Amino acid sequence: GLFGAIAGFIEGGWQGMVDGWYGYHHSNEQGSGYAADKESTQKAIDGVTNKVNSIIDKMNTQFEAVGREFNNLERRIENLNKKMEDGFLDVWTYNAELLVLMENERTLDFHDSNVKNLYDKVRLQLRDNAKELGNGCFEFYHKCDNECMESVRNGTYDYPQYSEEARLKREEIS
Amino acid sequence: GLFGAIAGFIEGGWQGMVDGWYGYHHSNEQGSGYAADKESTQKAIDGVTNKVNSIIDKMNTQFEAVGREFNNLERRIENLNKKMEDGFLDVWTYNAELLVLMENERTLDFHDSNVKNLYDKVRLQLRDNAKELGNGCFEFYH
Amino acid sequence: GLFGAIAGFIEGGWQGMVDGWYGYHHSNEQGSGYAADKESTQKAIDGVTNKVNSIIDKMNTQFEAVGREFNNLERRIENLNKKMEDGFLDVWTYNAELLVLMENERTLDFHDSNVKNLYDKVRLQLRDNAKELGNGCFEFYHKCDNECMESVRNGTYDYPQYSEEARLKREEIS
Amino acid sequence: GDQICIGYHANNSTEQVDTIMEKNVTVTHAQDILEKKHNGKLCDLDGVKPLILRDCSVAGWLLGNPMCDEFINVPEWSYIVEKANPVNDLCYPGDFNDYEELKHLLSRINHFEKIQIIPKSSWSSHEASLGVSSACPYQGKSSFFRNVVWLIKKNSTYPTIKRSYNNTNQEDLLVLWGIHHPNDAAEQTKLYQNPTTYISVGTSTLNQRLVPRIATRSKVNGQSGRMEFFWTILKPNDAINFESNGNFIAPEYAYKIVKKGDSTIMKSELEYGNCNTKCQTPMGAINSSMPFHNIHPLTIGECPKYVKSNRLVLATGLRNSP
Amino acid sequence: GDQICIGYHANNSTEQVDTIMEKNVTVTHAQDILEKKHNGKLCDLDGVKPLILRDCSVAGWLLGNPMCDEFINVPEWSYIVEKANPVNDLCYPGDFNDYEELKHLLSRINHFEKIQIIPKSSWSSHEASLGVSSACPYQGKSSFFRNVVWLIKKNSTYPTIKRSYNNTNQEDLLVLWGIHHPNDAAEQTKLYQNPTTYISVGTSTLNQRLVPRIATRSKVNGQSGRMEFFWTILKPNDAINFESNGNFIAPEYAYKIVKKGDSTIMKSELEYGNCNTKCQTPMGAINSSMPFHNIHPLTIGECPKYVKSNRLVLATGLRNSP
Amino acid sequence: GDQICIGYHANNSTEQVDTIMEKNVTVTHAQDILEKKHNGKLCDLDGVKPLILRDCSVAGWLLGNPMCDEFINVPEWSYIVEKANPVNDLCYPGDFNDYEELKHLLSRINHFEKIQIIPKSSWSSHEASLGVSSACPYQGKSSFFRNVVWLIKKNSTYPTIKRSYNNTNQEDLLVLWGIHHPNDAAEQTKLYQNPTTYISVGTSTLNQRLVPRIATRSKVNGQSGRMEFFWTILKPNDAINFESNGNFIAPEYAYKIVKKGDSTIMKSELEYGNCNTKCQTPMGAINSSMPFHNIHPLTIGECPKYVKSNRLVLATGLRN
Ligand SMILES: CC(C)N1CCC(NC(=O)c2c(Cl)cccc2Cl)CC1
Ligand SMILES: CC(C)N1CCC(NC(=O)c2c(Cl)cccc2Cl)CC1
Ligand SMILES: CC(C)N1CCC(NC(=O)c2c(Cl)cccc2Cl)CC1
Ligand SMILES: *[C@@H]1O[C@H](CO)[C@@H](O)[C@H](O)[C@H]1NC(C)=O
Ligand SMILES: *[C@@H]1O[C@H](CO)[C@@H](O)[C@H](O)[C@H]1NC(C)=O
Ligand SMILES: *[C@@H]1O[C@H](CO)[C@@H](O)[C@H](O)[C@H]1NC(C)=O
Ligand SMILES: *[C@@H]1O[C@H](CO)[C@@H](O)[C@H](O)[C@H]1NC(C)=O
Ligand SMILES: *[C@@H]1O[C@H](CO)[C@@H](O)[C@H](O)[C@H]1NC(C)=O
Ligand SMILES: *[C@@H]1O[C@H](CO)[C@@H](O)[C@H](O)[C@H]1NC(C)=O
Ligand SMILES: *[C@@H]1O[C@H](CO)[C@@H](O)[C@H](O)[C@H]1NC(C)=O
Ligand SMILES: *[C@@H]1O[C@H](CO)[C@@H](O)[C@H](O)[C@H]1NC(C)=O
């Protein structure tokens, strides 16, 4: 899509992550596992729920057809009546179908953007203390135990604490 | 927002910058201060002014209600008349409100994109000549 | 443009590339040349063709005006008729003009996004094996013959094969 | 080395949505916003039964076609249901003046109280009991509309009728009468004696003089004669005055308008379902919180908004990995 | 070391806007595009005063109900104002034929020049001064519509009227006449002598023969009789021809159509406010450069476009930092 | 060092498009979606010729105004074309009752076949050949509408007419008749003898009694009298019965409705152009795959959708 993240530089989704829309897979010595980003998932829920409610409410004032009857010498106004009612039904059908098409496109791109922004949040935390694999994954230049990983998730990673160790491994490998 | 710059990697706006929409804060030996990017601010003004004028003029061709009167044995056409007029008023009200909602969202994202692009303009100039702090600021290596 | 690529960090377009919308200019020892990215150009064609077809089909059920005639003592319904028909003509004219304005803006930004994503596809392949000039161009730290270039185009660049040579040219040797 | 990866949700969802540039996009979550289902029958509306006219037209009901005796005294209704082509209409052939304007008024009425305004037994100078036809059968015997009286000459004489009714009720009254258009001068003489006749009718607003028309007509339900019916709304404290020397189909019963509100005349062949709904269509009742439906445009009650669409699904979640 | 920072404007602005996904978003700059204010008065439109009928209906004005003498000669108008239920209408009760079609024509007219086409004094075989009623009082004395003449028998005779008027003007002429429907045959004799009467009226297009209807009616303003009024547009060089042996309410004054243009008949209970405006509504005038308003749908002049919205604000600036 | 660059297409294109925020944006490729051109002619519609009434009104055609003999027998049509103000209408002045409802019915009809319901030769107690006027000339001689008969008294008598016709056809019949409103009681006597006259007309649904009206009228085409015409649809197996003692403009020919379908009455001053089209407007025919046009709102056939726009161009390619 527009932001390059979903079905882009991140090739696929995780059946494994069940309790979130966006988040993380960590793999250290303690072992692997999935964890959802609560903050960005909740922000996305608020946005989509508001959008659905906004689309419904904007259609509160839509045209309501009424039965009128005409005799056999009132064919002109019978036809005027039928065209007026069909006319409004076709206008409100177009409005509903188009609003849904256009907001569906914005919703998918909204998700694409939320993933890209989550990835950038992490990249700007880790800086040269990790390697960008280009598949959504960051290979750490240091050891990052389950309590280091959580510091990345909650957005309080101490860059100086690990930078000296990271430099020694980085200048070694590259 | 969509582009991740406004209330994103740039945490907040500057009360200090008064004469522009987007720009710079410098702090060298001569001292600190704010300066607006004239080029990107003017491009944004041109775009928004055109958008406002485009929304107004697209509503030049909107439905105008007329008084028609009917006697007590013309209730069917009286009711047809009232529903036709209310019908068009509801269609043009929906058109106005939706266009404003949709273009408001694009305007805020337009600003978000202009800021991200200003930051990238500078990054691609400075390259390794400066350090990216990740808060919108570049520490110079001179 | 929203995505910063077209008439942005890529200063202008190539008269030289004729058989594609987006692609590459390579210049090695074997000599220069243009090549179009088939995959992203075809995806963009599919998208725009679907958009044109979607806009046309949404206007299949547009209002059709009918001739009705009225005598000299039917002026009120003659006027009702004329305003009803003009009313729907104005509604469908606004719908057509607005949909075209709004989708034109999305089309130009779609192209801007496709170019940005093509550039990022290549950057995430080349990693530190090449230098980002900041004008859309990557200077390789190794030799990249016409068969290396194609590996970048078709999206199967072997990063490990060239990483050791790339490091020796990039860094001080010892 | 240790790894942290950024990713997004995927699942076994098969739910599809459309966009401008792409059709049939699988997503992880969606909201269908279109009701497509109904119960296929006619229900009470917020506890109140509709008036279901079965084989009777509104005209059949209000004039009292003898085949419409089930509707002689109807309780309060929520809406009215009429078949496209009811067979029990004007049993004696003819016309109902401003019929569509009457049906339009009926759309704002929930209850009538039938009232005797001119007793059939009060016609002492005219025969009130010979006004019957084989066109209007009841149980194999010639009959007539029950709410009006076809007056005939008595002892070869038809004196001039001068009769009033004052609406001493606090409600509007729907009043119905008619004229007989005979086949020929001989029929005129046989029924009414007087050769040149009229019916005058006055209220505060009405100023009518009807003349019978002789013409040679095709037999309908075995009759070449025609009855032509007329109506008015008689406001509180107004009076209606009738004068006639023949061809008068006089009121006996009229209808007091005792409850006004939202109603409609719904065209439907469907059956009563002994059910309750908040939303009725001519194809069936709807029970839904969905904001849209595609059942039928002509609904009554608290209904979703009608659209012609076969499918309306909002994307809520992400593009799904197949 | 040295720093350069990229950033964006923020300010003291409290101005809020809405989007699909978020309500009540504070921004740095916005444009309100909805006019919500009016001056609560009826004003001149670009310097031209409206015709304000006060307690008079269009019918009361054009037939000249004696309570409508303020409108005996009205100057050029921008628009017309009529109350919902004007008390001065048909003082003698009855009907105005094709009244709503006449009001529709009036909506395209800015000026009439009233002219005497048949002087009241020119009726030498009929009484032209006895046509008065207690239904149409002027200063506690019996009177009548001023623009038409109720003709009565003279010396127990009503000869056949033959009168023509030729439109020798360059403009269309609106011509008004009427028929009297009495209460009884005795009243017919008393007023007109002849028991069987007609009014024939011919132009190049019109072919009318009116007959009175005698019937007993409810009293309205003390009268059981009814007047029924008719009108036509007499083209330049066409003639109108009247023939009658009774019940004729003859024209005296007719209206030359001297200015056509945009006008309207606006329903308002308000009175004149001695102001000027480019845009008038029935609730008050608008002075605005805003492109939309929510005052009332039925406006006249150079007006913003009407919408039902309570609020319309376009985002111009950025999302604002607290 | 070896280089790879990412780029995008540019070209010699001058094609411009609009967006909300920017007008007159040059692009590499675009699709115009608005048809603006027509051939300026009236054409056959999918191989079927229209009925082009030239100087005749629908009334002139159906009553048979003698200037309308070109239309005495018309083949199946695709649509009808009438001028704004046709000169050949009611040659004898008067009125056509529910005329606009008749034209509305005609809009759903592709073919009429003329049928004789009352033979001109069957009027043996009345003069059938004196019913002519200088208002209705044919070749410098007084004439009359050809589809109806103006009956006159014979030898100072007008016996009561009783005539019936039973619709033994599978199709609806359009039937036309009329009444004469004379100038005075003297004219009434001269033409019809009987001073007090009527026309009664009955079917299964119709119950009409017409009375002439004497009024003093301005001359139109030299006449102060007026003819007033009436019509009905006679269903299969129903009968129409006429009775009159004067002022009767009696049917001779009526119209079988043999083909119903999509048709229209189109107002145009143009004449036939010996062309074929799938889409006709009053200003000319359209041959286009474009989804929109701005020619005229009132079209017939497989047409693009009408809009009031001067310009509609979709961006397909890139900014140039
Ligand atoms: C629990 C989590 C994995 N997801 C995210 C939230 C939930 N939301 C939606 O799909 C949604 C739906 Cl299905 C309807 C209206 C609004 C929303 Cl946000 C779907 C389940
Ligand atoms: C600080 C100053 C340069 N700003 C930015 C531009 C200015 N303009 C607008 O907001 C605007 C407005 Cl307020 C109305 C119409 C069009 C526009 Cl562009 C608002 C004030
Ligand atoms: C190099 C060339 C084949 N490109 C690819 C797309 C081609 N076609 C279009 O722009 C197009 C047009 Cl002109 C109409 C409808 C759909 C499309 Cl994709 C023109 C430019
Ligand atoms: C989407 O899938 C269903 C499968 O039955 C089908 O009806 C519909 O036409 C499909 N649309 C496209 C464009 O493939
Ligand atoms: C019938 O009425 C006439 C007078 O109108 C009268 O002479 C006759 O006796 C009446 N007959 C009966 C039996 O009432
Ligand atoms: C927006 O704020 C205003 C107060 O200025 C208030 O009227 C309104 O309820 C708020 N709306 C929402 C949805 O929060
Ligand atoms: C009808 O009767 C009421 C008394 O209940 C009276 O006020 C009114 O004047 C009467 N109306 C007529 C027209 O006789
Ligand atoms: C009206 O008078 C003019 C001029 O005297 C004359 O030419 C015209 O024929 C008259 N119109 C009628 C209808 O008699
Ligand atoms: C370019 O823009 C103007 C409006 O800004 C418009 O009139 C026209 O379509 C374009 N070409 C001109 C002015 O020649
Ligand atoms: C006219 O009327 C009678 C027929 O009864 C007779 O005097 C006369 O011969 C008739 N015919 C002609 C042609 O005079
Ligand atoms: C017309 O003719 C047929 C066949 O003789 C007959 O069945 C039908 O009843 C006739 N219609 C009328 C109205 O007499």
Numbering used by the authors:
A (entry chain D), C (entry chain B): 1 to 174
B (entry chain F): 1 to 142
D (entry chain C), E (entry chain E): 10 to 331
F (entry chain A): 10 to 329
Text lifted from the article:
Infection by influenza requires the viral envelope protein HA, which mediates entry of the virus into the appropriate target cells through a series of orchestrated steps. During viral maturation, HA is glycosylated, and it assembles into a homotrimer anchored to the membrane by a transmembrane domain. In addition, each HA protomer is processed by cellular proteases to form HA1 and HA2 subunits, which remain associated through noncovalent interactions and a disulfide bond. Subsequently, the pH of the endosome is acidified, which triggers the loop to helix transition in the “stem loop” region of HA2, resulting in a large conformational change from the “neutral pH structure” to the “low pH structure” of HA.
To understand the structural basis for fusion inhibition and give guidance into future efforts to optimize this class of compounds, we determined the crystal structure of CBS1117 bound to H5 HA (A/Vietnam/1203/04 [H5N1]) at 2.20 Å resolution. For this analysis, crystals of the trimeric extracellular domain of H5 HA were soaked in a cryosolution containing 5 mM CBS1117, as described in the Materials and Methods section. Analysis of the resulting electron density maps revealed three CBS1117-binding sites at symmetric locations on the H5 HA trimer. CBS1117 binds near the HA fusion peptide (residues 1–20 of HA2, shown in red) with a closest heavy atom approach of <5 Å but relatively distant from the HA stem loop (residues 59–74 of HA2, shown in blue) with a closest heavy atom approach of >17 Å. CBS1117 binds to the HA surface at a site between the HA1 and HA2 subunits of a single protomer with the compound forming contacts with HA1 residues H38, Q40, and T325 and HA2 residues W21, I45, and T49. Specific types of intermolecular interactions include hydrophobic (residues HA1-H38, HA1-Q40, HA2-W21, and HA2-I45) and polar interactions between the chlorine atoms of CBS1117 and side chains of residues HA1-T325 and HA2-T49. Thus, the compound appears to stabilize the prefusion HA conformation by bridging interactions between the HA1 and HA2 subunits with very little structural change in the side chain conformations of the HA binding pocket (RMSD value of 0.26 Å between apo and compound bound HA for all atoms of 32 residues that are in closest proximity to the binding site). HA1-H38 has recently been proposed by our laboratories to be part of a pH trigger through its interaction with HA1-H18 and relatively close proximity to the fusion peptide, and thus, the close proximity of the CBS1117-binding site to the histidine pair may disrupt the triggering event and subsequent membrane fusion. HA1-H38 interacts directly with CBS1117 via hydrophobic interactions and presumably the loss of this interaction at this position results in reduced binding of the compound. Moreover, the presence of a glycosyl group at HA1 position 38 may be expected to further diminish compound binding and potency in group 2 HA due to steric hindrance.
